């Protein structure tokens, strides 16, 4: 239960001063980066303990916010290209492929529900509403973002 709070308290100090570039899905290359996104794609439970994506974990998720056969294609896609990168890239490998298909649009709401639901600041039911992404923005506000 290591929270993505958890995980940028431990942030090594060239990418702390970068957190609000990370919190916007901005891309920054690194292993530095490859074991952060590690940390956190583990701790919203989207990635297996190699950081291979977990097809199911995102699937049903996806589609019920947008209902689209993409979401299936680019999971295949982006799964695939993580299993061929060594497991210290493979997460963020992941994520990154996820971010730059056609899924990545629903992916950071999936993502962002599921980062305040596991920090118990909306509940287990709550839909991506105006109301939700206000609470986003002033979450991210109290972190100087
Ligand atoms: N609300 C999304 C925050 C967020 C998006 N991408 C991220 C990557 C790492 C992280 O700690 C946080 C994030």
Redesign the pocket.
């Known amino acids: 239960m290591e929270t993505?709070?958890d995980?940028?308290n431990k942030?090594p100090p060239s990418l702390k001063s970068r957190?609000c570039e990370?919190?916007?899905?901005?891309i920054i290359e690194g292993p530095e980066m490859d074991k952060?996104?590690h940390?956190?794609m583990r701790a919203l439970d989207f990635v297996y303990e190699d950081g291979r994506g977990d097809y199911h974990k995102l699937y049903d998720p996806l589609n019920i916010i947008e209902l689209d056969k993409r979401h299936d294609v680019n999971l295949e896609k982006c799964i695939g290209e993580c299993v061929q990168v060594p497991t210290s890239e493979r997460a963020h490998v992941f994520?990154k492929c996820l971010l730059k298909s056609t899924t990545g649009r629903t992916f950071?709401k999936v993502?962002?529900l599921m980062?305040?639901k596991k920090a118990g600041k909306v509940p287990q039911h709550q839909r991506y509403t105006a109301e939700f992404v206000q609470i986003?923005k002033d979450?991210?506000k109290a972190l100087n973002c």
């Open positions: 993505v709070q995980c940028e942030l957190l990370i919190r916007r899905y901005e952060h996104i940390c956190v994520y950071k993502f962002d980062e305040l986003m979450y991210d």
